[PDB]
Write an enzyme that holds these catalytic residues in place. Sequence first.
Site, mmCIF file in Angstrom:
data_model
loop_
_atom_site.group_PDB
_atom_site.id
_atom_site.type_symbol
_atom_site.label_atom_id
_atom_site.label_comp_id
_atom_site.label_asym_id
_atom_site.label_seq_id
_atom_site.Cartn_x
_atom_site.Cartn_y
_atom_site.Cartn_z
ATOM 1 C CB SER B 43 -1.431 0.079 0.917
ATOM 2 O OG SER B 43 -2.014 1.043 1.377
ATOM 3 C CG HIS B 156 -14.053 -3.659 0.315
ATOM 4 N ND1 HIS B 156 -12.945 -4.550 0.753
ATOM 5 C CD2 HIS B 156 -12.908 -2.972 -0.639
ATOM 6 C CE1 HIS B 156 -11.912 -4.587 0.507
ATOM 7 N NE2 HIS B 156 -11.630 -3.495 0.106
ATOM 8 C CD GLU B 165 -14.073 -6.210 8.082
ATOM 9 O OE1 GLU B 165 -14.093 -7.373 8.197
ATOM 10 O OE2 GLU B 165 -12.404 -6.379 7.135
ATOM 11 C CD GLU B 206 -12.510 -10.022 3.938
ATOM 12 O OE1 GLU B 206 -12.650 -9.512 3.198
ATOM 13 O OE2 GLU B 206 -11.268 -9.544 4.825
ATOM 14 C CG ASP B 244 -12.518 -2.627 9.710
ATOM 15 O OD1 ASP B 244 -11.718 -1.463 9.540
ATOM 16 O OD2 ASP B 244 -11.400 -3.439 9.128
ATOM 17 C CD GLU B 293 -9.268 -3.275 12.143
ATOM 18 O OE1 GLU B 293 -10.070 -4.770 12.488
ATOM 19 O OE2 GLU B 293 -8.638 -3.500 11.007
ATOM 20 C CG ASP B 320 -5.361 -1.850 9.912
ATOM 21 O OD1 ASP B 320 -3.706 -1.728 9.655
ATOM 22 O OD2 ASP B 320 -5.913 -1.651 8.995
ATOM 23 C CE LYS B 345 -4.006 -5.898 8.144
ATOM 24 N NZ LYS B 345 -4.432 -4.568 7.362
ATOM 25 C CB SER B 372 -4.528 -8.890 10.848
ATOM 26 O OG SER B 372 -3.521 -8.667 10.323
ATOM 27 C CG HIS B 373 -7.052 -12.063 6.579
ATOM 28 N ND1 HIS B 373 -7.664 -11.507 5.598
ATOM 29 C CD2 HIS B 373 -7.873 -11.383 7.870
ATOM 30 C CE1 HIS B 373 -8.860 -10.749 5.659
ATOM 31 N NE2 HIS B 373 -9.208 -11.137 6.851
ATOM 32 N NE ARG B 374 -2.549 -6.492 3.953
ATOM 33 C CZ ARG B 374 -1.247 -6.314 3.685
ATOM 34 N NH1 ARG B 374 0.026 -5.933 3.729
ATOM 35 N NH2 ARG B 374 -1.465 -4.904 3.193
ATOM 36 C CB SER B 375 -7.210 -8.676 0.311
ATOM 37 O OG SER B 375 -8.033 -7.610 1.302
ATOM 38 C CE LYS B 396 -9.094 -7.880 10.481
ATOM 39 N NZ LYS B 396 -9.785 -6.772 10.095
#
Lengths: 436, 436, 436, 436
Positions: B43, B156, B165, B206, B244, B293, B320, B345, B372-375, B396
């Site tokens: 990013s 999204h 979300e 997701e 979030d 968040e 974040d 992350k 946490s995860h990524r996209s 998460k």
Amino acid sequence: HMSIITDVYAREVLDSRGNPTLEVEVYTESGAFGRGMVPSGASTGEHEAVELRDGDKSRYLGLGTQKAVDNVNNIIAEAIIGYDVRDQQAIDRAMIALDGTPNKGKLGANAILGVSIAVARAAADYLEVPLYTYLGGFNTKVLPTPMMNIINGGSHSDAPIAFQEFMIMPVGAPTFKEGLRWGAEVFHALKKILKERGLVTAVGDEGGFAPKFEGTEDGVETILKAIEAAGYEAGENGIMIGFDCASSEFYDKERKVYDYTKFEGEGAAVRTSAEQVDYLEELVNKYPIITIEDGMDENDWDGWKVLTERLGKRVQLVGDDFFVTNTEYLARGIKENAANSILIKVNQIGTLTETFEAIEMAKEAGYTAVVSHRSGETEDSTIADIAVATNAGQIKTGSLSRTDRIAKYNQLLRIEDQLGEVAQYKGIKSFYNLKK
Amino acid sequence: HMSIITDVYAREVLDSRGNPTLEVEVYTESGAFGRGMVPSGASTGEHEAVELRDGDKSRYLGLGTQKAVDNVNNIIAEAIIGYDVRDQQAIDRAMIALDGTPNKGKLGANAILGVSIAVARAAADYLEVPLYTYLGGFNTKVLPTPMMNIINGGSHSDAPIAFQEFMIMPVGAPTFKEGLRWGAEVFHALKKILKERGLVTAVGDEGGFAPKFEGTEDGVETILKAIEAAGYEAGENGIMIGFDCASSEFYDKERKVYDYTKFEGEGAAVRTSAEQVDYLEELVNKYPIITIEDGMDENDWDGWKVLTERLGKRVQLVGDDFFVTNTEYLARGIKENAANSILIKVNQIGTLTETFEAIEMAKEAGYTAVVSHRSGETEDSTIADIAVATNAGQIKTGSLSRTDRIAKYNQLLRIEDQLGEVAQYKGIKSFYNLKK
Amino acid sequence: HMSIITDVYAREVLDSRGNPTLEVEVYTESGAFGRGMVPSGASTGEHEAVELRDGDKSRYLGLGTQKAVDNVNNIIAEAIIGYDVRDQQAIDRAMIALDGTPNKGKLGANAILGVSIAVARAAADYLEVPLYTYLGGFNTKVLPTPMMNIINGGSHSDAPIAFQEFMIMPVGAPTFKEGLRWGAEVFHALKKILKERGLVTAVGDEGGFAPKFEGTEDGVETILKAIEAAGYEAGENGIMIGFDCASSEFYDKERKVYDYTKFEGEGAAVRTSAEQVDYLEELVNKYPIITIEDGMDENDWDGWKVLTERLGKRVQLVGDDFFVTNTEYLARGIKENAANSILIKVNQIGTLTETFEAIEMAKEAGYTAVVSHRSGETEDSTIADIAVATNAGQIKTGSLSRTDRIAKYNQLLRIEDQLGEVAQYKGIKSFYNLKK
Amino acid sequence: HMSIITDVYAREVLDSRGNPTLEVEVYTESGAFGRGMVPSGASTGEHEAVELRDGDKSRYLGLGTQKAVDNVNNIIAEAIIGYDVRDQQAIDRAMIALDGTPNKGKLGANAILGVSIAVARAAADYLEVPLYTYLGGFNTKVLPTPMMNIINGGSHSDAPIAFQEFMIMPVGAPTFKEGLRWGAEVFHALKKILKERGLVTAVGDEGGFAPKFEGTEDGVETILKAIEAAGYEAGENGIMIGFDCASSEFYDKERKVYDYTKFEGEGAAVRTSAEQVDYLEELVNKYPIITIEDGMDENDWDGWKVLTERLGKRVQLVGDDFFVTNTEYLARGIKENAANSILIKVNQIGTLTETFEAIEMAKEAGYTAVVSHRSGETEDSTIADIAVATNAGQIKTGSLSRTDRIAKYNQLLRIEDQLGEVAQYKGIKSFYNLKK
């Protein structure tokens, strides 16, 4: 099946101070091996864990350890042989279930702890890794800053002084190796001052002096003159001072008062809890103080509240027999804001698993945790690996004199040599309960 | 010399979403083995670590990874061949020095992270142990509470809602296996409701739903119907709800105001930071909300103070894009009282060594740390070991439909089977930043 | 005795779509190891193999797998421990005899298949060879040509379209690595077209779109516009198209007729079998088609004659629900000239040995055999090794979106990298049932 | 080639008393291990072997050991790498030739002794045997009678007494474990007496007492009260007393007389060597004295004749500064009839090869050999293996309080447990130089 435990065995031995203690052996099928021997301590009228003593005044004034030897050899070994050497938490849980009392009375806490340590050491020998790596994983990097006794008082002295011990901390040094030489150079300069002044230079159980000083101010001022004679600076750029008051001693339950006339003359003061907080604050404004251990009674909870509110932003305040390494009391202390630091003793609780449980709980509340020796000690060095394994930042490991003290510092020098350029020393930055 | 690394090798592969990523394999002389593949994520506008990409517009629209594979195979391999597999910290530090830049943009953060994860998996192979025991030592025991995505909004979705979300947490459950069951029975009961209403049931990146709701209250009252329809209670004894906000996406940098007409209708509100705190408080008074968040902009440091004084003892606040997994920013936030939690992350920072130093600093401040995860994701399941190796108590990792999500929840069912009677699930007790 | 099976063990897990499935473990005396987890599917009123489901609506809407776990752990394991890990056919035969029903109803087909796969993987781990080498010997060299789902209809859509799915095949590429990038570049160009037209871009179970097209011709022509936007050619030199009609759905038994008004409006046609053959031939003359799956009812045997006589020289015709992976129906199909190709599903039959038996029989008749996924999937990749092990030339492994699909393509990239200069790609020459 | 030495490495550490010392580690190709650390001890005016020290006044007052560590790491290591670990005598002889000086003052006697002790510990590791069995063969069986220090005088106290220390021997006991018990029960009963009298109970370098007694008779009659108070008999059937004079310290080199006005009041005696023998005989006629050490000056060879002819069939006479562990002086004393016993200090001579040649020459003359300790010590316990490997029957290793003493008595409890029904304790039968 190479990792299975084949046998566990115990014998009677002596501690420093020449009193009976206990030692345990563990072997695997491959012949991987570990020894566990226990530091000496008991207590009564409290929820500490209980030792067994034989109680027959024919031997060693009743202090022998034979019933605890029998328990290891005729009951615990039978039930533990056939586990994997790596099943630490299932092993320590099986021992608690087997005793089946609250404070470990049928088997004894001394029997159970020496099994618990020998198992951990045997597993590190099997895997061929250092014991701080086996215990903590792979961020194990931080060398603790030591708080080291040099002068004694109260019940450990003949002198007119209330507090039990006085200590130095080398917070300004660049590494643990230089800091150990700053410590030693001040200890050899103090000795030359007491010779010029005609005072006793022999030692007590923790390896420090107990001389006939003129009063509680005179010891503090002699300690500052030794720091200057050694060629260093006093305060956060160099060396600083701490107390252990043991204040539960000089407290009257019926008068509800602190009363200095036990350890000081008929002219010494009587103080309320508010006068105790006021007295501690004058000392803190007059001298380079960084930490106070106890300073209130075990049960003066309303006083621990007022004290933490008065001084907890500036100074570390430490619970010892306030908390007794026990998580049920620690929780209430965190809830009611009763301290900012705790002292750790493996044999007050009795397993390795319950010990690491208390450290992680203190850390989440933003408290510091300080690992410590007992008075009677062995040639064991285990608590130095616990201090590095958890990156816990501080240690209480005695004076600069005897091998029951020096062996722990000599193990820390080998760990700092092994870790090479990964190794880190915090100095003043180790106080995260301050700096907030 | 059985422990020594003999070769390191990389190739180009695909993520879910169908773009190029990277994979690494590592071997010892004994023939122990590990593999690591990196999640897809970079990013712009704050100091995340930098991915290397090929600029070549004619393959994969210029998203190709062949220059990164050349950096591993021609440069990193000859630096790392000849180390012992067990020395994580030294291999991690040597890659950082070999790049020589503060953003890791000579070699690429994607190339550095793959070699870091592959070494640790070959070490747990060589030692014959579970990966969580290798990463954390032998006091590992706590299965994490899940926060699971169910509905989308903002950028999204095409519904008129600003927040990005929505989530649910099974705080009332005895065991991790029972909380996972509750999450699946709510997910299915919601799909039955959406069909009866005539809305879509195709899923997003997701694996959650994104229907055309009329506004945020309808989305919340929809989730509340599914909990009642599966047969559980809303609140601290059953299921709680979480939000979030990507708040920076509708914050005005020039007018210094939060302008909801970016994603809502042109009749919607235009709020100053005082009015934000009043708005989020009105949501929390109304609905059983446990966590929020990124609820203020990246640079609204003052608005983050006011949010924290107003709400910060009721609910969790997570940073974040306020922190980017960076210790310089978390250190300023601790000094300045700016939140109570951090999102971690692993690919924002670039090594396992730096990742564990971020989780540790938060825990000494009294903050929770959430992994946490990524996209863009893979079939690798390493972040579920990172949770149980640190006893952290929250994860998460997305919804209950696609294998890029379900493979992380599968590994936690395995870990709970092997811990047996030792294993823990804390539930509502995990929010130790609150309940104080 | 290093190669003897020491134990076999099962647990409950989840598939993609979040429904209960099953997983099995195997160990040898040396500690060689394999995992087998099963893809999800059931059927009724046919000679397919049967799953066990628990049927208690208290858990997972009756779909739990707990009775199949009991069968593995309390019956099969007892009988299988003590065989050599390499005794594959004698192991599969012992399981059929133990169940002793025709359709594997006493033990369940899901229980038996997961044992069968874990044994094969454990043997490859013992011998230290790749699983395609263990299964097929050493002509294992041919990379399969993939058929990639991208659009959906019938029961999987809201749109006015009869047929269940549409696919692309990259038959003109020089290698499997370039062909996977030809496929991906068309998938990213299609998304951009549906965005310009304001259509839904979310996904279903196989990872493809289901948009509101105006009809079956609009669907086909949108796919051709995406192939052009991506910069390739349509026909044998480049990319071509296939259908799965699932025509057993839109068939009226009592009128004995094909009736398009189920998935299309009140103005849609009624067709006899001769009109069905005439309709399929017009489509085949208008577009770059190469393969049709189903296109006749399960029981329209007289119609399968006329269709194979009309189009079997030009186009591939595929049996799925016609043959059900079962050799007794395949034999009659070969005898009466009913198709020229068959689809393979390992869990319709339930053992590895009976699966390879059907592939060998089809090949001798000059038929093609195509290996396939199910709708609910796991992180297992076994069917990619079956495709290379038999040199079978074609695969049906889903879209370019989710990890339950992408994991199979990522395994094929590692096999083509391992085989090096030996590796072969056929393209259009893979159709040996044509080109005759 | 598994037996070969592959590495040898040195570091700086601390002794008890808190000064710099030295430590060495040694490895084989098989990965057998040993470590050795040297006691801190040198003296001037006689032919002891020479320690190397850094002259640098700014670290540790010029007591640092870094030049010695450089001699091991840069010179000794490259000479000794490539030998077999079992060849003690050849490695010992090669180090002596490499220094090339009669006092070992090129490399340092501290550097030579560490490498010598570490090799022998790696050999017993490599062979899988106890160290006493490795040093002595397989006829090892005699646990030594202890002589244990309890009271000080001379230079080591401020009381008006010339003699340097006092000891007790448990000659009446059946087992080593029972003699150790008696020594602890006398040590504690003495401390109870000193408190009742108002005297100090802090301890000196060896862990014994140094109160202000009025003179030597009061010190002796004090020890006699403690034996009666614990409940044992004085003399050959229970406990016997022993003396040690540093008699050179009050001998006059110019007037050639023994002058007690050095450590006692100005009215005290001034004795010629005839008057010395008459004085020591008057003590022996009065009290249960078994042994005397250094009872004439280092150079009073004629006075040592007359002492030996008068007392030498009643009493053990021990030479320490008369011999300095040197075979040239013990050889002259044997030829000239000058004593009946020798004190052995491993660091006065500098190898294990020369140490065993000194113990052997004494046994052939009919003299006892007594293994002993320095003032500065470590947690190493190797001198208790030297005693049982030679069946020698006497050890001097200090009091019953500090771990630098108790670790030597702990190792003897282990050897007695492991010899079982074979083990011996001789008691009064060990004085084979007398009882003739």
